């Protein structure tokens, strides 16, 4: 029961789990009555969800993953924990390969966990191995890492992943586990269908929502002093501990380097000390600006997309300019409030920005269509931007807008965004943008 999981967790990996979801996922795999989908971030709790259950299963767990870099890093650690793991890749000498194929044909092989590429898992040079494993009831779990590579609406589509659906079907008796860090509901639809996962598919999706972050849009068009507004936002967010004076630090995001340089100046003039970070600076300059921010010499950094970090006391992230994508806005904005203390996330929206960026997306989508040809991904790129304009231009819980797009349940807002806090002033400010249209 739960009894065994605790001990095997402790005995081997030397652990309680990083979260109670990570827990619930792992337990479900173990019951092995169901396929399961795990969308968790790069915290790497996901790995345990298939690794631990593999040991308790008294058979072999195959683990499909797209590239060696990804595989190698784990197998090294898995060994170090004295666990019988094996990578099968064509970067391997014929002898090492053939050693392993031999091992797999043994009643009771050494290998517990086999890390394969989709290439090999597809190759007919491996199907007989696979057949014999199946027939000898030796396959405990099929695992597919980077599951999202099966989706053309995903950022990283791989035709090889299409063969994996056929594979799951052959390996019927075994539970299948799919993992990715990044899936829109459309990508989850593709994953469940393409990999022929079996209902009820149990899902363990890390929620986007963070209580301690306060989300609001401002319209640069409806604003006398934009620069002044920003400084007041920065002021409120810094000095949440006035006995210290200025507590915390903050990021301002811009599309262009000149915007950064200029906005750094305007802020510094108004009495909020900000230095610009962009690829335009010598590398030396960048390492120094990063330092000052990181060691609180300078409370505010003004940066382009090129921001290298993991500070805990980020009291605010302001987007001066709309981001290329909902996901990039989530990623970038979420650099705030890692310490768990209150933080402020603000988007400054301009229809001229929307237009300026909408074009640059399409222009850099065109540069790819010339380089390689058309992709359903190119539609998703534009869809990724459309979702953020909708975030700005509609009335609704800002947190819930994000959770809808990613595929989370309705979040526990608690007057944690502009619209949840005063629905009517948001109505006012939208109405206002319609008049100025």
């Amino acid at each position, epitope marked *: 029961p739960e009894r065994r999981v605790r001990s095997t967790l402790k005995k081997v990996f030397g652990f309680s789990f990083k979260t109670p*979801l990570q827990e619930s996922a792992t337990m479900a795999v173990v019951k092995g009555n169901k396929d399961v989908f795990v969308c968790m971030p790069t915290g790497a709790g996901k790995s345990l969800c298939y690794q631990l259950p593999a040991l308790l299963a008294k058979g072999i767990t195959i683990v499909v993953s797209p590239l060696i870099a990804l595989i190698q890093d784990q197998v090294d650690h898995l060994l170090t924990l004295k666990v019988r793991v094996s990578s099968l890749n064509s970067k391997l000498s014929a002898q090492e390969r053939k050693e392993l194929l031999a091992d797999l044909e043994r009643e009771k092989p050494q290998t517990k966990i086999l890390y394969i590429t989709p290439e090999m898992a597809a190759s007919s040079s491996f199907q007989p191995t696979l057949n014999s494993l199946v027939s000898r009831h030796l396959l405990s779990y099929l695992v597919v890492d980077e599951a999202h590579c099966v989706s053309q609406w995903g950022h990283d589509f791989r035709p090889d992943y299409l063969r994996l659906g056929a594979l799951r079907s052959r390996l019927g008796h075994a539970p299948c586990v799919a993992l990715t860090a990044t899936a829109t509901p459309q990508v989850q*639809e593709d994953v469940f269908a393409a990999l022929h996962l079996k*209902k*009820p598919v149990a*899902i*363990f999706k890390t929620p986007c929502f963070r209580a301690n972050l306060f989300y609001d849009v401002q319209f640069k068009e409806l604003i006398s002093d934009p620069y002044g507004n920003l400084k007041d936002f920065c002021l409120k967010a810094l000095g949440q501990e006035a006995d210290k004076g200025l507590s915390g630090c903050g990021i301002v995001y811009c599309r262009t380097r000149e915007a950064c340089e200029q906005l750094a100046i305007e802020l510094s003039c108004r009495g909020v000390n900000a230095k610009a970070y962009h690829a335009g600076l010598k590398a030396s300059e960048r390492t120094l600006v990063q330092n000052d921010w990181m060691e609180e010499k300078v409370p505010v950094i003004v940066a382009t997309i090129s921001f290298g970090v993991d500070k805990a006391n980020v009291r605010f992230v302001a987007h001066w300019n709309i981001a290329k994508s909902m996901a990039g806005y989530y990623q970038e904005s979420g650099r705030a409030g890692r310490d768990g203390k209150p933080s402020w996330c603000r988007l400054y929206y301009s229809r001229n920005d929307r237009d300026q960026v909408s074009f640059l997306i399409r222009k850099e989508v065109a540069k790819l269509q010339e380089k390689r040809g058309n992709k359903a991904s190119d539609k998703a790129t534009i869809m990724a931007f459309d979702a953020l304009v909708t975030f700005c231009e509609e009335l609704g819980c800002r947190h819930a807008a994000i959770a809808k797009y990613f*595929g989370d349940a309705l979040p526990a807002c608690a007057k944690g965004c502009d619209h949840c806090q005063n629905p009517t002033a948001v109505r006012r400010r939208l109405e206002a943008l319609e008049r100025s249209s």
Partner: nanobody
Amino acid sequence: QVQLVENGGGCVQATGSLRLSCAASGSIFSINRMTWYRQAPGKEREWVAAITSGGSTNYADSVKGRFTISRDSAKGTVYLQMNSLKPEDTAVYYCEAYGTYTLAPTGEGEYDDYWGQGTQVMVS
């Protein structure tokens, strides 16, 4: 798990009208396809009409024009407006929640198909 429960059925006269309401319970995020089936006594289950998430609708020929399927997106509920009824239409009507994505704010979810309880529909 999830509940599909149908409402709005009864006995009505030929050339009359009903509007069926299919209610889906549980933490539903989305439903790929909701479809209306009717089971006439002594006949095979008949496919009536259906609506995709994003509102694409299609109808059996036997009911085109007479019937219309609709989504109160707000409500998370589908409706089959049946006008110009006939004794033929007499049957039990149920729903199929195909590709039903269910999610809690814990992160703990499912994806599965669900079948409705049914509601009686009699036409004199």
